Amino acid sequence: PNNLKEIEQEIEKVKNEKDAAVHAQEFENAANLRDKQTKLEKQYEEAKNEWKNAQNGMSTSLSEEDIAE
Amino acid sequence: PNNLKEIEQEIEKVKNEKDAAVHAQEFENAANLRDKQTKLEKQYEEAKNEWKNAQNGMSTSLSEEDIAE
């Protein structure tokens, strides 16, 4: 639902940014990025779990409209 | 003269120690070790240069005792 998409993208760019710091020996910034990534993943798990939890709230059923299409 | 040896040994263990921090994502310790390694190499260059500076001061001569041995 257009939420875990962008959140996952931020995790990707953060990981690349940390890799650049590691190869450049900029460990001062790398330490901050490591904690930031953990923050992103922590909220990522909660956001995904609540989404699938709400998915079970409603049941997807077919209808003659779908077959008509 | 037991000077470049001891400095090189400390540089060697520091280099391995930094790798331990990097693989363990201990970036805070990595920065501290990185500065220490640079400081040691600074002393290594000075000690190595001044060692051969003293060596060039005198010239080794072949005494007849060396031939006798």
Coordinates of C-alpha atoms in Angstrom, one line a residue:
Chain A
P1 CA 0.0 0.0 0.0
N2 CA 2.6 2.5 -1.1
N3 CA 4.2 2.6 2.3
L4 CA 6.7 -0.4 2.5
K5 CA 7.8 0.6 -1.0
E6 CA 9.4 3.9 -0.1
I7 CA 10.6 2.6 3.3
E8 CA 12.4 -0.3 1.7
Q9 CA 14.0 2.2 -0.8
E10 CA 15.4 4.3 2.1
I11 CA 16.9 1.1 3.5
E12 CA 18.6 0.5 0.2
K13 CA 20.1 4.0 -0.2
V14 CA 21.2 4.0 3.5
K15 CA 23.0 0.7 2.9
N16 CA 24.8 2.0 -0.1
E17 CA 25.7 5.2 1.8
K18 CA 27.2 3.2 4.6
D19 CA 29.2 1.1 2.1
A20 CA 30.7 4.3 0.8
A21 CA 31.7 5.4 4.3
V22 CA 33.3 2.0 5.0
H23 CA 35.4 2.1 1.8
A24 CA 36.4 5.7 2.5
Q25 CA 37.2 4.9 6.2
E26 CA 34.7 7.6 7.3
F27 CA 33.7 5.5 10.3
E28 CA 32.4 8.6 12.1
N29 CA 29.5 8.9 9.6
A30 CA 29.3 5.1 9.2
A31 CA 28.4 4.7 12.9
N32 CA 25.5 7.1 12.5
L33 CA 24.3 5.3 9.4
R34 CA 24.4 1.9 11.1
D35 CA 22.1 3.2 13.9
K36 CA 19.9 4.9 11.3
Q37 CA 19.4 1.7 9.3
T38 CA 18.4 -0.2 12.5
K39 CA 15.8 2.5 13.1
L40 CA 14.5 2.1 9.6
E41 CA 14.2 -1.7 9.9
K42 CA 12.6 -1.5 13.3
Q43 CA 9.7 0.6 12.0
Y44 CA 9.7 -1.4 8.8
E45 CA 8.8 -4.6 10.7
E46 CA 6.0 -2.9 12.6
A47 CA 4.6 -1.2 9.4
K48 CA 4.5 -4.5 7.5
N49 CA 3.0 -6.5 10.4
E50 CA 0.1 -4.0 10.9
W51 CA -0.6 -4.1 7.2
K52 CA -1.0 -7.8 6.9
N53 CA -2.9 -7.8 10.2
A54 CA -5.4 -5.4 8.8
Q55 CA -5.5 -7.6 5.6
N56 CA -7.1 -10.4 7.6
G57 CA -9.8 -8.0 8.8
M58 CA -11.5 -8.2 5.4
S59 CA -12.1 -11.2 3.1
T60 CA -11.6 -10.8 -0.6
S61 CA -14.4 -12.5 -2.4
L62 CA -15.2 -12.8 -6.1
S63 CA -18.3 -11.2 -7.8
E64 CA -20.0 -11.2 -11.2
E65 CA -18.4 -7.9 -11.8
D66 CA -14.9 -9.4 -11.8
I67 CA -16.0 -12.2 -14.1
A68 CA -17.6 -9.6 -16.4
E69 CA -14.3 -7.8 -16.8
Chain B
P1 CA 68.5 -1.5 15.4
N2 CA 65.4 -2.8 17.2
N3 CA 63.5 0.4 16.3
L4 CA 61.9 -0.2 12.9
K5 CA 61.1 -3.7 14.1
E6 CA 59.1 -2.7 17.1
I7 CA 57.3 0.1 15.3
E8 CA 56.4 -2.3 12.4
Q9 CA 55.1 -4.9 14.8
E10 CA 52.8 -2.4 16.5
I11 CA 51.6 -1.2 13.1
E12 CA 50.9 -4.8 12.1
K13 CA 48.8 -5.6 15.1
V14 CA 47.0 -2.3 14.8
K15 CA 46.1 -3.1 11.1
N16 CA 44.7 -6.5 12.2
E17 CA 42.9 -4.8 15.1
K18 CA 41.2 -2.4 12.7
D19 CA 40.0 -5.2 10.6
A20 CA 38.4 -6.8 13.7
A21 CA 36.5 -3.5 14.3
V22 CA 35.4 -3.2 10.7
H23 CA 34.0 -6.7 10.4
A24 CA 32.2 -6.3 13.8
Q25 CA 30.8 -2.9 12.7
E26 CA 32.5 -1.2 15.6
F27 CA 33.0 2.0 13.7
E28 CA 33.6 4.1 16.8
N29 CA 36.7 1.9 17.6
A30 CA 37.6 1.9 13.9
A31 CA 38.2 5.7 13.8
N32 CA 40.3 5.5 17.0
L33 CA 42.5 2.8 15.5
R34 CA 42.7 4.6 12.2
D35 CA 44.2 7.7 13.8
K36 CA 46.6 5.5 15.8
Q37 CA 47.9 3.7 12.7
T38 CA 48.5 7.0 10.9
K39 CA 50.4 8.3 14.0
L40 CA 52.6 5.2 14.1
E41 CA 53.4 5.4 10.4
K42 CA 54.4 9.0 10.9
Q43 CA 56.9 7.9 13.5
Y44 CA 58.0 5.0 11.2
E45 CA 58.9 7.3 8.4
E46 CA 60.9 9.6 10.6
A47 CA 62.7 6.8 12.4
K48 CA 63.6 5.0 9.1
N49 CA 64.9 8.2 7.5
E50 CA 67.0 9.2 10.5
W51 CA 68.4 5.6 10.8
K52 CA 69.9 5.7 7.3
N53 CA 70.9 9.3 7.9
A54 CA 73.2 8.1 10.7
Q55 CA 74.2 5.1 8.6
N56 CA 75.4 7.4 5.8
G57 CA 77.4 9.4 8.3
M58 CA 80.1 6.7 8.7
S59 CA 81.6 4.4 6.1
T60 CA 82.3 0.7 6.9
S61 CA 85.9 -0.3 6.5
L62 CA 87.4 -3.8 5.9
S63 CA 89.9 -4.5 8.7
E64 CA 92.4 -7.3 8.2
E65 CA 90.8 -9.0 11.2
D66 CA 87.7 -9.7 9.1
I67 CA 89.8 -11.4 6.5
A68 CA 91.5 -13.4 9.2
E69 CA 88.2 -14.6 10.6

